[PDB]
Write a protein that binds this ligand. Structure first.
Ligand SMILES: O[C@@H]1[C@@H](O)[C@H](O[C@@H]2CO[C@@H](O[C@@H]3CO[C@@H](O)[C@H](O)[C@H]3O)[C@H](O)[C@H]2O)OC[C@H]1O
Length: 142
């Protein structure tokens, strides 16, 4: 069993986490809740010049300890095929990876050793044009 250390479930939760849309793409980007689908939604009509120019925490206050093994689980879809970059950890340093999403609601998992104590799920998608939807984020261990 993947025992759940942490969950944020956007099926019901609102969104209050840190996010930063670079001024380059401020007019054409939105980050917030879609209360009909029941998900976090990141919508873009213009690609940014850098992927980190649309960056947002999808989870925070994580109960992770340096050197322990976990999984990050995220349920994601998009309006077209694309890539979500992430890191799990504090601002000093993270365990990094990416998910390649499609138009179906699917769960993605990333196994990692924590590189630090605590932190957040930094998520970046500035190069993606369209709609990204995120249903939940979990941290688990075996
Ligand atoms: O991918 C990298 C980006 O994530 C990075 O963005 C900056 C990251 O630091 C942010 O500032 C933090 C704000 O919260 C405080 O508590 C922290 O101490 C600050 O460091 C800043 O707002 C982001 O622009 O830019 C570099 C990219 O490689």
């Amino acid at each position: 069993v993947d025992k759940v250390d942490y969950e944020i479930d956007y099926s019901t939760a609102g969104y209050s986490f840190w996010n930063e849309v670079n001024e380059e793409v401020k007019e054409t980007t939105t980050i917030g809740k879609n209360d009909t689908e029941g998900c976090l939604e990141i919508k873009t009509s213009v690609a940014a010049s850098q992927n980190h120019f649309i960056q947002y925490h999808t989870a925070d206050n994580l109960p992770i300890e340096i050197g322990k093994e976990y999984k990050l689980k995220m349920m994601v879809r998009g309006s077209a095929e694309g890539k979500l970059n992430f890191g799990v950890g504090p601002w000093s340093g993270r365990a990094e990876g990416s998910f390649s999403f499609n138009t179906e609601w699917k769960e993605y998992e990333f196994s990692f050793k924590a590189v630090a104590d605590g932190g957040h799920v930094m998520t970046q998608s500035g190069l993606f044009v369209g709609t990204i939807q995120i249903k939940y984020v979990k941290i688990t261990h075996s």
